[PDB]
RNA sequence: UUAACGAAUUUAUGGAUAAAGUUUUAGAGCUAUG
DNA sequence: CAATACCTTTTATCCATAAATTCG
DNA sequence: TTTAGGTATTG
RNA sequence: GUAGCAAGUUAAAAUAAGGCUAGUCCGUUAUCAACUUGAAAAAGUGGCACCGAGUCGGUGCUU
């Protein structure tokens, strides 16, 4: 006796209920709690607002740093351990001094100066080496024994900040000068090639090689500079090799197989000797020279400056930035003193101003500083060498900035290496541990390994060789690198859908190939002259054809089968094959690729080897790393020749299949003794298909399958497995929590129908006209020009693609009056450009039930082709225009018109259908087949979208929140109506497998527009009492039903519930705050009084708790009873939950009433006084309660008043829509009045409302379309939810925030259920 | 995922890295003047 | 108090898997 | 990428 | 304390409090009205028809 309609979105689930005759019911509901209200009537329509679902990504990123920090403090801890023994000899508490660098002198346990204890030597230090970068150069360059404390500072400073690992290989300090390296590259070629010696002459190798151009264009530009040699010639192959390019040297030496050499790819050191051996070892001296140049090129962009004087270019690059800053500061500081010495105090002394004082001491970015002084620079003289420095964006640069990190960790390691090498003679431990220390800088946990856990991390998957602690130096021995790399993918690879306990096999698995061949072979039937009836392929032939034709060639065409097997082996000269199509879709691709390498056809056939051949593909498909493949295959090396193994390691397989090994060959019928595969050959006269095998009740497969699956799962897992946005899953869970409650309301009765629906270029317009009049060559673009912001107007934009001529008439069209000209769809209702055309009269096409007629096509079949070749129309647009010559829109073509429009393509929505449908129909009849009690309809959203505009139910989002229920109601109406009149479409719209045939075009309707039967009158007749033709059921009464629908829309009571949510996540605002004497300053770490060190602020409040107890007041300390709202923060919450009372007493409460403590989540609901509602937004803040029921005449008005997208509809309807504006013109005063009583009743903001009231008074003479739209802003003041700022016309009206929660404490608390219908009300009295 | 194989983008989940920011302290501020 | 005004870490790089989506 | 709750200070 | 002037670019340390399972692990996602039952997962709990409509109001029968 009822039906449910849903409208699912990101932030709301909308829900309404419908009757046989389309009324929405009501019911008296019990009210729990101590309040005198014992009952309420509420309508069975509602919606559920909620905060969006938050993705894990934001969280996961925090995790990356969380590990990034606990691994970096470990790296420095690693250097310190190396020094600990040796350093204590030099400085007893050097490391201690650093640990406590952050403590204030009162809390410091040692000397205040870190690098050296004494005040004198530390000042000398910054005197000589102002930057660490200054020091790095000296530690690299000098030969003098430098203090061990400095060595540590430099080395630890490189290990703390490595730069990035985005390069693999090594770059050298020698390799910066490309020309110096280039000449060696030319030079070696000359010591080897006296028959064709080359001369570098005066080629500019520096400029040509290191350029932002293609790796290809630079190659050509170089050899062009040389006297003329081929890029295919050997020198170019070398030069290409330096360029990050892959060249082939086969052409020069004409080697039997191609051997290319790329410097990024792994296969280079190994590939060299396999190629190098044939030419001989003498050449190799050349190839290393080329590799060196590559390393020269690569860092040619990173370290652009001259680096000839030093082995530490990076620090040298910094030292230059420092001195330039010093130089240019004085010139800037001086030139301001010289000409403008009044602003200098603002510039260099005011921290807050974004001056240099702001740049250094204030919080001002180089982008903010550059901007602020650029005006000053150009008013004083000599400011060119400094202004060119500012446009260069290199002026008064800091050394540590945002653009670094383009630095590759290798150049740091270069300075590290130099420092170690320099000072190892002086310090023995440096020379012993040099390699041990360098690995600290170079080591990176390989991603496939994952976090190195000891079974106590969710994310980890790694495997360990020894249960001992992991360090960068013993990493290979302790960690099973390979078996981790497999576990790495195996945990992300899918499971078998039919048997979800077993792993999916590789897509190129040999067993997968056979199964995939035989499943196509079993359903092949052959008909011959000798035979009366077609017969399935029998057991021998499948096994014959496979041995004969599939092992011999990659793909098997139908002609090969009739010729090679049927005619040759069975001697049938002619035959017809029904089952297979033109060629066999399956192939034995792994067989032949494996057959070619190992070359033992006997080997691939011994079923004893199937275990061994599966393993090679699983290892080959799985693994990326060349070395690790070898480690797995070594066990196989004895079976194989040493040359056979070489090719095996190369072939890699990509992809994962669908089905398990156990499914195909493990599962066995208890009675037949046979597997899935064994039934795929030899299934008797009837050869059964794979689906058929699982779906045969005589076989144990349907019974065995069901055992694995049910062993199924709770709702979360079923919902969470859903693929798609993680917030739209929330609405799903909420939409399904809604349905389960509606059924409870209806006395635990299941409903007949359920309707679910879910909601989801400016310059493009200029370019499709720009180039389409360039190839047309017409002057209609020059004759009248237009702009890039205008073309979102349909009629203007259609003219320009049309070129000023109508496709239906062939004449020049006036630019000024497009209102009289109709926008015409090629196919009667599509509103996109692909199907939109603008002509003076839409009847010129002929019959508006017909395709644009043969009369206009013969006139204009040519003009629309000119537009196609100029991309002024799309192939779909042209093919629907010309379709008149393919007999027009065929019944079978017109069926494709409507059917494609109605069905929902979105995979998520479909899954929602299952979720609902399977949760409803638990009963099964005596047959195996399921009983379809509840019908789950998926409605497209557009249908209702047009229905409201078509039938005067206009939707305005921002006036109100009722439209969420409104769309649910209106999805419920159009849904049940479309299935009442069309049960042939049940299979198309309902998740139900009935079956629907395209053939009809039970005739039903001629008209290609599905949404016609609702219409009382239709633009060219329909009876106002509709009934299905076949059953006689009364489906739609245009007179009777439409009255209730507007009545339901214009209903003033709808249940709107905002889901209550404990707030989770970050403790507090992330920013660090400078020291204060506040008590809201949260400590950063325990030993740090925020008053001395600075701390956090602005804790988020996880939930509020209501505390009724006594507190001490005054020096008198008399105990007086207070009832107030305590904020439990996220940091607090864990501590709170263990012991509430001890925790409460710690915050200052005494004699707390434990029974009465109430935990108040965010968005919790309070009604006080005159029914005004407040939602508790914080322990200390409140939020707006109430939704304003603007009457339907205004909603319908304001949508038409706002004048949405000018007017889209038919022009004759539009005139009365325009007339509706003036007729109801006085409404504007009614709308503004509505708010005033509602403001005073609920909102309590008179301060603001008065500037509102006083603002509307002034703009009375401005047009309605301009005036009404700005009236729409005003509602945001009335909106349920938070106070936010709104602007009328030119005046911004700030928000009214409720910074007291006192009034709540004496109101009645409302606990509402998911629907909003069941409640428990609680009146609060101390 | 398609009546079947490939490719690509996007979103989701996960891993290994990087450079900034912020905070306290260390970089003896001097010279007239109470 | 209740207004009033101000505040809120960001921005890169690479690897893997999966659906869902639009092209072949 | 803007929300909407902490926070301190004023007339 | 004011007026002058010199100066500045760098560094160490922390980067959710913290937790025990002490790992070169983990600590911001999902999930949540209320009441009874539960360690939890979860299960359980709220008569109907009519007339009407400014955020649900009245009446009739059973209860």
GROMACS .gro file of C-alpha atoms (C1' of nucleotides) in nm, chain A residues 447 488-489 492 723 905-907 911 1069-1071 1296-1297 1300, chain C residues 2-3 5-9 13 15-21:
model
   30
  447UNK     CA    1   5.896   0.135  -0.213
  488UNK     CA    2   5.364  -0.612  -0.260
  489UNK     CA    3   5.157  -0.680  -0.568
  492UNK     CA    4   4.667  -0.542  -0.433
  723UNK     CA    5   3.406   0.159  -0.622
  905UNK     CA    6   2.491   0.412  -1.721
  906UNK     CA    7   2.665   0.475  -1.388
  907UNK     CA    8   2.812   0.159  -1.237
  911UNK     CA    9   2.534  -0.152  -0.744
 1069UNK     CA   10   4.509   2.425   1.422
 1070UNK     CA   11   4.841   2.313   1.282
 1071UNK     CA   12   5.024   2.649   1.298
 1296UNK     CA   13   2.550   3.713   1.318
 1297UNK     CA   14   2.734   3.458   1.535
 1300UNK     CA   15   2.678   3.209   2.395
 1362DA     C1'   16   2.792   4.114   2.323
 1363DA     C1'   17   2.972   4.273   1.911
 1365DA     C1'   18   3.792   4.167   1.327
 1366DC     C1'   19   4.126   3.839   1.238
 1367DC     C1'   20   4.294   3.389   1.201
 1368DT     C1'   21   4.320   2.920   0.966
 1369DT     C1'   22   5.080   2.486   0.656
 1373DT     C1'   23   5.852   1.370  -0.738
 1375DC     C1'   24   5.627   0.333  -0.802
 1376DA     C1'   25   5.219  -0.008  -0.752
 1377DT     C1'   26   4.691  -0.198  -0.768
 1378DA     C1'   27   4.164  -0.141  -0.871
 1379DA     C1'   28   3.724   0.030  -1.093
 1380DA     C1'   29   3.485   0.351  -1.407
 1381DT     C1'   30   3.506   0.608  -1.807
   0.00000   0.00000   0.00000
